[PDB]
Amino acid sequence: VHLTPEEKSAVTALWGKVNVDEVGGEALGRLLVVYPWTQRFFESFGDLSTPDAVMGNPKVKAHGKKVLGAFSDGLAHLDNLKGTFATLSELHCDKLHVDPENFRLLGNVLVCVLAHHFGKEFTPPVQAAYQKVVAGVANALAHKYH
Amino acid sequence: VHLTPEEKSAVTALWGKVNVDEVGGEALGRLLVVYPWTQRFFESFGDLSTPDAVMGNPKVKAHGKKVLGAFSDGLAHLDNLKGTFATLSELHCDKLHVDPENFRLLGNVLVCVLAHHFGKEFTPPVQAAYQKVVAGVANALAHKYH
Amino acid sequence: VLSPADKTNVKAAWGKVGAHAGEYGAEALERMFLSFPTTKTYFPHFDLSHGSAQVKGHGKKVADALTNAVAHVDDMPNALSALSDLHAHKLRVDPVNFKLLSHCLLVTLAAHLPAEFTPAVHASLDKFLASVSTVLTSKY
Amino acid sequence: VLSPADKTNVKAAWGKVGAHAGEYGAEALERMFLSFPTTKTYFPHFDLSHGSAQVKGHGKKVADALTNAVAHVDDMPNALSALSDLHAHKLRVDPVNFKLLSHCLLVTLAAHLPAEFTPAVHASLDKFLASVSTVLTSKY
Ligand code: HEM
Ligand code: HEM
Ligand code: HEM
Ligand code: HEM
Ligand SMILES: O=N[O-]
């Protein structure tokens, strides 16, 4: 995806402020709570019977941290998302068979978490730039389907 | 998109039997009737007040013929859909702003028309191969959004 | 909302399908598994090969549900209550998959009803399957 | 179906929004136009620039509709009837666009309700906006 230098600027300035040990698990937690069919793919994580149970679940935090690591990785490779995400696409597509609509969903949930964490600072232009980004990652993660 | 030689075989054998002056307008007609929000983009075609009015509309047939021409074109360039569809993507994305979900919809309506026209001959494996195809065209037409 | 014209059109096509409805239900399921392989993971204990008894038996259950929905078209949430529970709560069926199975059910009808599958009737059946889909995903 | 817990959660967040609801409605619309430019073509006669009076006035109409929907949560099809007519019949709004505006309405709440936007409440509001979306697209 092509971000303008003003879009690039919006994305990276906010991102340096992100708690990378936390924001991932908050976005995964919320995905599982808001779109509970996604709990299908996480049967082994244990107690998911409640919202608190999800957010407080150590496995949800542990795994969301890796997810956020992968997002950080595409933010460094905006012009090579297809390349960056190949292995993960192979995994979620060929091995896991997660429907790609869910990639767009997790992207949007992350946007919601950023808005929650940053308030006023997550301005409508800043959101627009992050939408191009999570759109680009979803699409690259889904390449093993195209 | 990569079709196996058996998928390729399924697609091209059926396609040589297609009435190219007809099938396009049948698929466009049905898109407008079944998903009537798409009539938004065709205000100038005239009487769309009825199903018969749509299918019998000379402009619907005229334009669907060009649409089918574009599909025939991707069937010849399976390994270069991005290239083949660039100009049309620019048009539907940058100028028309058609949401890309509708590209997937028209693809599926075309599959329905093929099934209607070919019956028994449009077998479940033959459908599977055509789904990879209309998925690949939708995705290439939507590249000016990614 | 399903209109009178739509209720009439869906009742029509149901009638022509007649007793082939379980067979066509099985064929729609195979069309879905071949066309959209992600859907296969919900049936990990089925043999999904062609001619499978388990796919046949399931096809009949799906076609019977849809027939119950046509027969109680004005009261679908109530007629389909137990099945919406099943698919949302227990099976956790992703809502996208309803669109894929609806599309294959339409293809299967088109392939078998040259006369009945006109543009108006295709519209009405699409709306019917989307209404059933809405019910079946209403319970997450 | 919206549960009692969901009805309670949505009523809660509505309450904290208080009289900022028109302003937040305008902000959600701008978030949508910037993030998903395709939606702009439905407003060809609006100035969509920041601070636009026309975007402000529309924001208030949207927030008032949603407030009418909360206030008549058990009777949404009837409360939103005229608006579902409007958006499906006259305006021909593509159903995908309801998802985009719902998402921006959620972002706008999240950006303004640190305390109220917990995971349960986010779930309940998502379900509320999806129910409103279902009503608003029910009439094609
Ligand atoms: C939105 C973008 C997403 C990103 C960036 C992402 C990233 C990742 C990463 C980095 C891993 C761990 C892979 C490893 O250990 O090498 C992973 C595993 C996994 N993801 Fe995702 N993921 C995404 C979406 C999804 C969604 C939406 C689902 C299901 C709803 C899903 C289900 C899984 C599962 C089940 C695993 C564990 C697979 C295994 O290790 O065997 N992911 N993901
Ligand atoms: C599914 C794949 C589609 C293909 C292959 C396709 C192909 C085409 C072609 C070949 C043209 C004529 C361009 C020219 O004259 O050079 C065209 C024009 C157009 N298409 Fe599509 N189309 C698709 C989907 C859609 C959809 C879903 C919509 C709206 C619902 C749409 C709206 C239009 C409009 C409004 C025009 C006329 C634009 C103009 O000439 O100014 N198309 N399309
Ligand atoms: C038109 C929509 C659908 C209808 C009318 C329908 C109907 C049914 C019915 C009647 C059953 C009960 C079978 C029994 O009692 O033994 C069932 C079970 C099931 N459905 Fe669906 N369903 C639909 C859509 C879907 C979709 C989209 C999926 C996922 C791709 C799905 C996956 C299943 C599964 C996994 C079972 C349990 C099967 C088993 O282990 O035997 N259904 N469905
Ligand atoms: C939560 C969903 C929505 C609500 C509650 C809603 C509400 C409304 C209301 C209350 C009006 C009436 C304005 C008036 O009477 O003057 C209206 C008009 C309109 N809506 Fe929506 N709407 C929604 C979604 C959408 C979406 C997704 C679009 C397209 C992107 C859309 C496009 C419009 C347009 C073009 C008008 C006419 C505006 C004009 O010319 O003044 N709406 N909507
Ligand atoms: O817009 N229906 O997913």
UniProtKB/Swiss-Prot annotation, chains A, B:
Effect of residue 111 to A: In Stanmore; O(2) affinity down; unstable
Outcome when changing residue 36 to S: In North Chicago; O(2) affinity up
Consequence the record notes for mutating residue 68 to P: In Mizuho; unstable
Variant or mutagenesis effect after changing residue 38 to N: In Hinwil; O(2) affinity up
This protein's record includes keyword Phosphoprotein: yes
Phenotype for residue 139 to Y: In Aurora; O(2) affinity up
Phenotype when changing residue 37 to S: In Hirose; O(2) affinity up
Modified-residue entries (N6-acetyllysine), positions: 59, 82, 144
Effect of residue 5 to R: In Warwickshire
Phenotype upon changing residue 93 to R: In Okazaki; O(2) affinity up; unstable
Effect of residue 88 to P: In Santa Ana; unstable
Annotated effect of mutating residue 131 to K: In Shelby/Leslie/Deaconess; unstable
InterPro entries hit by this protein: Globin (IPR000971), Globin-like_sf (IPR009050), Globin/Proto (IPR012292), Hemoglobin_b (IPR002337), Hemoglobin_oxygen_transport (IPR050056)
Effect seen on changing residue 42 to S: In Hammersmith
Effect noted on mutating residue 27 to V: In Grange-blanche; O(2) affinity up
Reported effect, residue 103 to L: In Heathrow; O(2) affinity up
Effect of residue 100 to R: In New Mexico
Annotated consequence of substituting residue 69 to S: In City of Hope
Modified residue annotations for Phosphoserine: 9, 44
Effect of residue 126 to E: In Hofu; unstable
Substitution effect: residue 108 to K: In Presbyterian; O(2) affinity down; unstable
Impact upon substituting residue 140 to V: In Puttelange; polycythemia; O(2) affinity up
Resulting phenotype, residue 34 to L: In Nantes; increased oxygen affinity
UniProt site (Not glycated): 59, 82, 95
Annotated protein name in UniProt: Hemoglobin subunit beta
Source organism (scientific name): Homo sapiens (Human)
Swiss-Prot record, chains C, D:
Consequence of substituting residue 48 to R: In Montgomery
Effect seen on changing residue 31 to K: Causes alpha-thalassemia
PROSITE patterns, per database record: GLOBIN (PS01033)
Effect listed in the UniProt record for changing residue 2 to R: In ChongQing; O(2) affinity up
Outcome reported for the amino acid change (mutating residue 56 to R): In Port Huron
Effect caused by changing residue 23 to G: In Reims; slightly unstable
N6-acetyllysine PTM sites in chain numbering: 16
Consequence the record notes for mutating residue 90 to M: In Handa; O(2) affinity up
Effect of residue 115 to D: In J-Tongariki
Impact when changing residue 78 to K: In Stanleyville-2
Effect of residue 88 to S: In Loire; O(2) affinity up
Site feature (Not glycated) residues: 11, 56, 60, 90, 99
Stated consequence of mutating residue 87 to N: In Auckland; unstable
Outcome after substituting residue 85 to V: In Inkster; O(2) affinity up
Effect of residue 44 to L: In Milledgeville; O(2) affinity up and
Record PTM text: The initiator Met is not cleaved in variant Thionville and is acetylated.
Listed result of changing residue 43 to L: In Hirosaki; unstable
Effect of residue 6 to G: In Swan River
Disease linked to the protein: Heinz body anemias: Form of non-spherocytic hemolytic anemia of Dacie type 1. After splenectomy, which has little benefit, basophilic inclusions called Heinz bodies are demonstrable in the erythrocytes. Before splenectomy, diffuse or punctate basophilia may be evident. Most of these cases are probably instances of hemoglobinopathy. The hemoglobin demonstrates heat lability. Heinz bodies are observed also with the Ivemark syndrome (asplenia with cardiovascular anomalies) and with glutathione peroxidase deficiency. Alpha-thalassemia: A form of thalassemia. Thalassemias are common monogenic diseases occurring mostly in Mediterranean and Southeast Asian populations. The hallmark of alpha-thalassemia is an imbalance in globin-chain production in the adult HbA molecule. The level of alpha chain production can range from none to very nearly normal levels. Deletion of both copies of each of the two alpha-globin genes causes alpha(0)-thalassemia, also known as homozygous alpha thalassemia.
Family: Belongs to the globin family.
Note: Gives blood its red color.
Assembly and interaction partners: Heterotetramer of two alpha chains and two beta chains in adult hemoglobin A (HbA); two alpha chains and two delta chains in adult hemoglobin A2 (HbA2); two alpha chains and two epsilon chains in early embryonic hemoglobin Gower-2; two alpha chains and two gamma chains in fetal hemoglobin F (HbF).
Cross-referenced PANTHER family: HEMOGLOBIN FAMILY MEMBER (PTHR11442), HEMOGLOBIN SUBUNIT ALPHA (PTHR11442:SF48)
Reported function: Involved in oxygen transport from the lung to the various peripheral tissues.
Full protein name: Hemoglobin subunit alpha
Species lineage: Eukaryota, Metazoa, Chordata, Craniata, Vertebrata
Gene that this sequence comes from: HBA1
